[PDB]
Amino acid sequence: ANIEIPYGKSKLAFDLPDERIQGILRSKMSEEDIVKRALENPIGTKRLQDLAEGKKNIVIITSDHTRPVPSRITLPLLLDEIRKKNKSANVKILIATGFHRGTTLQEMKAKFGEDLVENEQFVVHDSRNSENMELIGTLPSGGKLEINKLAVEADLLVAEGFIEPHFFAGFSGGRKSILPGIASVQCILANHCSEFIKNPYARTGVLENNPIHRDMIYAAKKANLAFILNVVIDSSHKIVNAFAGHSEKAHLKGCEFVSEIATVNAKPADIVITSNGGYPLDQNIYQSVKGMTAGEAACKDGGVIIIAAECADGHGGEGFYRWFKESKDPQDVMNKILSRGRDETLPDQWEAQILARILINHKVIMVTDSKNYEYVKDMFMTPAKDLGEALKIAESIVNNDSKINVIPDGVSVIVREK
Amino acid sequence: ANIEIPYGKSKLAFDLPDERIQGILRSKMSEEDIVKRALENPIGTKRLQDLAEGKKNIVIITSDHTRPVPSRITLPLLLDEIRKKNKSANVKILIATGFHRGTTLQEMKAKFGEDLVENEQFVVHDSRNSENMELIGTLPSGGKLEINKLAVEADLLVAEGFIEPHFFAGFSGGRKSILPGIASVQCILANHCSEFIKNPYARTGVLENNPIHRDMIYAAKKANLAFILNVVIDSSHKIVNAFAGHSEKAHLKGCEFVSEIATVNAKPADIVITSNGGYPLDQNIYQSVKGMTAGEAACKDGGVIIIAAECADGHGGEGFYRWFKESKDPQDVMNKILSRGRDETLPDQWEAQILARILINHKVIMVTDSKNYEYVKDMFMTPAKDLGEALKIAESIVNNDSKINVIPDGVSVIVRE
Numbered sequence: 001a002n003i004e005i006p007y008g009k010s011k012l013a014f015d016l017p018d019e020r021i022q023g024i025l026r027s028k029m030s031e032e033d034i035v036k037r038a039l040e041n042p043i044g045t046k047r048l049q050d051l052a053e054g055k056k057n058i059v060i061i062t063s064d065h066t067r068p069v070p071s072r073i074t075l076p077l078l079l080d081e082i083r084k085k086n087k088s089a090n091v092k093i094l095i096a097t098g099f100h101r102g103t104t105l106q107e108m109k110a111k112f113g114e115d116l117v118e119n120e121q122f123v124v125h126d127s128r129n130s131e132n133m134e135l136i137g138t139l140p141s142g143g144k145l146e147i148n149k150l151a152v153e154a155d156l157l158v159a160e161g162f163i164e165p166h167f168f169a170g171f172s173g174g175r176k177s178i179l180p181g182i183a184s185v186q187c188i189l190a191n192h193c194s195e196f197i198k199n200p201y202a203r204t205g206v207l208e209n210n211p212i213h214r215d216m217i218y219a220a221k222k223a224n225l226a227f228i229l230n231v232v233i234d235s236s237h238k239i240v241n242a243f244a245g246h247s248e249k250a251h252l253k254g255c256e257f258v259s260e261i262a263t264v265n266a267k268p269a270d271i272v273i274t275s276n277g278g279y280p281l282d283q284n285i286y287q288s289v290k291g292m293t294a295g296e297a298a299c300k301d302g303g304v305i306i307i308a309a310e311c312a313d314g315h316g317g318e319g320f321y322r323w324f325k326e327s328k329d330p331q332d333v334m335n336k337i338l339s340r341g342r343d344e345t346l347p348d349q350w351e352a353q354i355l356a357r358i359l360i361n362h363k364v365i366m367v368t369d370s371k372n373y374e375y376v377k378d379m380f381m382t383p384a385k386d387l388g389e390a391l392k393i394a395e396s397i398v399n400n401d402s403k404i405n406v407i408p409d410g411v412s413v414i415v416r417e418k
Numbered sequence: 419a420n421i422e423i424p425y426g427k428s429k430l431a432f433d434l435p436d437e438r439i440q441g442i443l444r445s446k447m448s449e450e451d452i453v454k455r456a457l458e459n460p461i462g463t464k465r466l467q468d469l470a471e472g473k474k475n476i477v478i479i480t481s482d483h484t485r486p487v488p489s490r491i492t493l494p495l496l497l498d499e500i501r502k503k504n505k506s507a508n509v510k511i512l513i514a515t516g517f518h519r520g521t522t523l524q525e526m527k528a529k530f531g532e533d534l535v536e537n538e539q540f541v542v543h544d545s546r547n548s549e550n551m552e553l554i555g556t557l558p559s560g561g562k563l564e565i566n567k568l569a570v571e572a573d574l575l576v577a578e579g580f581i582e583p584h585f586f587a588g589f590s591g592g593r594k595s596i597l598p599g600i601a602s603v604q605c606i607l608a609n610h611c612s613e614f615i616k617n618p619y620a621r622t623g624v625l626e627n628n629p630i631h632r633d634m635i636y637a638a639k640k641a642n643l644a645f646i647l648n649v650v651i652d653s654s655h656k657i658v659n660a661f662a663g664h665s666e667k668a669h670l671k672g673c674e675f676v677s678e679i680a681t682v683n684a685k686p687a688d689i690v691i692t693s694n695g696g697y698p699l700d701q702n703i704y705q706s707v708k709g710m711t712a713g714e715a716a717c718k719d720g721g722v723i724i725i726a727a728e729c730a731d732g733h734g735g736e737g738f739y740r741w742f743k744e745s746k747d748p749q750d751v752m753n754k755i756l757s758r759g760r761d762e763t764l765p766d767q768w769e770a771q772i773l774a775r776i777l778i779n780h781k782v783i784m785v786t787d788s789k790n791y792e793y794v795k796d797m798f799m800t801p802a803k804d805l806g807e808a809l810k811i812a813e814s815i816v817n818n819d820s821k822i823n824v825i826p827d828g829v830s831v832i833v834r835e
């Protein structure tokens with residue numbers, strides 16, 4: 001088969017003989033009309049126009065400059081819907097930065113457009129400003145819950161977002177607008193604790209019994225998140241579907257849709273070849289752990305996962321990197337991280353924990369920019385210059401006849417064992 | 419003797435013997451606290467917090483990128499005042515661009531700062547968007563009056579701005595926030611018509627019988643402009659005084675103060691030396707006309723006005739330039755302009771008109787950038803390199819013994835007889 005594997009700003013072309021292939025596992029109206037249909041057909045609530053009637057302090061939570069939410073399309077339609085029975089509504093748009101540094105004005109202009117940034121009230125969440133946080137409750141796990149005060153003070157709290165798989169929260173969107181999106185840095189870090197990450201339900205496309213998700217769901221309830229609009233978007237960031245209404249029920253209908261498109265069924269193989277979805281999704285090693293998890297799920301214990309990830313920006317986190325650089329082997333990394341309690345979670349630790357989980361049971365070979373070979377070696381992986389060399393290395397480790405699972409885009413799929 | 423004349427980013431030095439000098443004619447506690455004092459002591463109205471109580475939709479008109487209103491100081495205090503007895507007021511800030519192109523986001527950041535631009539609702543007036551203009555009346559002069567719908571629709575309409583001399587409206591501020599600030603393009607052009615601009619009361623520091631002013635006051639009344647805050651700023655753009663309240667009474671009080679500071683008495687001389695006040699006020703010839711009018715007031719008929727103005731950006735308007743380049747002499751420009759009726763004002767016409775008025779009865783020498791010389795000659799004026807040069811040319815035209823009035827900053831003064 002001539003397989004095209006996303007890589008940086010290109011694709012890699014690889015001729016892999018069909019006899020070597022287990023399976024090649026791939027994921028399966030105007031944009032504005034898709035959005036209006038959702039809004040006009042809310043799942044589990046009244047229409048937003050009805051919810052917003054007579055309210056005097058509305059807050060819409062939106063995603064930040066780092067997320068692909070097509071807000072130039074979605075925000076005007078939400079604002080119009082809000083105003084249909086409340087022309088003089090006060091509406092604040094609160095940017096859910098989570099842990100991140102604040103969105104800059106240039107970034108706001110790029111995301112939302114100049115007129116919208118000017119004409120409406122945008123406020124940037126700062127997870128590090130305690131004065132603007134309010135304790136609102138205690139979570140199922142026992143942790144405190146602190147969120148942005150503006151959200152708490154709102155007469156009606158709304159959020160927008162998008163839905164795609166996520167390698168430990170199951171999916172993006174819905175409740176994530178609250179935790180982590182507008183939560184305190186401490187609450188965010190606690191929501192990534194080693195105990196949570198180790199749970200067997202903290203996996204791609206898994207929500208039920210997922211304790212990370214359980215805390216988020218409770219956070220959203222306690223925040224009185226009353227309505228969401230979540231989109232599903234293609235590679236190009238074009239809206240292809242949309243779900244609106246109850247913050248849980250509408251999110252689930254969207255996740256059900258995404259599960260149907262993204263789920264692939266794998267017979268585990270001795271070798272898996274995958275990628276991290278090309279640039280910008282493959283910009284660093286940190287991000288490439290996501291594609292590796294799709295690998296892990298399609299690989300036999302002790303097998304080899306080959307991942308193509310350009311990683312133009314290097315390792316993607318000093319702390320992430322240092323966990324490996326400073327330890328004996330992946331089991332050492334895991335043991336260190338698991339020794340960390342719920343209030344001791346440090347930035348990057350969860351990404352290291354997941355990569356250690358992979359590397360304890362599997363070898364990983366990274367096809368990556370030569371700038372990164374030493375990093376890859378330092379992280380108990382093996383660099384390769386191209387897919388041909390990667391396959392020769394894998395074959396040395398297993399056999400030169402092993403059937404191979406090919407997952408051309410590792411970050412877009414939910415791998416289910418067949 | 420030692421005079422310093424603003425020119426671009428700095429000040430020219432030049433040494434002038436006092437036998438030749440008629441007169442040197444110049445103008446005369448925290449900024450936050452000054453604004454707060456004005457708001458706490460409104461002129462001819464209750465406090466803005468009282469006026470805003472119970473009003474759901476509120477609009478504050480603020481000046482555009484061309485005006486140095488210190489809005490980083492003034493807007494938060496206005497917003498605070500409006501919200502005192504009305505925490506859920508829906509407040510829009512409408513930028514009064516008048517005839518100008520719209521303010522860019524970068525310019526909004528510079529003027530208002532990032533947080534304020536984000537956190538509040540800022541709307542840019544577009545005089546050319548007719549669907550967004552509403553007919554609200556007919557002026558004292560007979561013209562239609564159409565202004566931005568957001569303002570007409572407000573429960574309370576408020577404006578901020580600043581008070582300084584203005585070469586044809588008398589003073590800036592107050593009513594000017596409405597017409598031209600948020601008026602239709604057609605109305606703006608009508609308000610600068612040849613018949614208004616020719617009027618002998620359409621002049622610096624004159625409001626009484628000024629027909630331009632008359633139309634603007636009528637427009638602010640029709641628009642229900644309910645409260646203003648207008649500051650007075652020194653040369654640094656520091657707030658030195660402030661006046662709030664009734665849109666006419668508070669403005670008049672502020673204009674009387676500016677009159678006290680800015681008025682200079684000149685005995686007409688054969689030569690005047692002046693400037694357009696330096697960067698950013700002397701960036702093009704269009705703007706320099708403003709300072710030439712102070713020269714005009716201080717100069718005998720037939721005399722010589724020398725004005726220092728860098729004019730880095732050149733003429734300041736293709737429209738304005740073409741008036742002169744497509745005409746025989748200043749009188750011919752004037753004849754074409756005064757042929758045009760109230761509805762036929764072309765873009766930049768009024769600036770050309772005023773310059774032609776000057777050039778009909780005075781010779782103007784511009785000390786300006788060498789790249790501007792052809793433009794200066796095409797516009798029936800004489801370019802010069804530095805003042806020493808200018809003076810030599812001006813003595814060639816009049817006497818070698820002729821008296822000089824010096825007006826170091828031609829845009830900050832009101833020249834009285």
Ligand SMILES: [Mg+2]
Pocket residue numbers: 116117118119120121122534535536537538539540
């Ligand atoms: Mg804004």
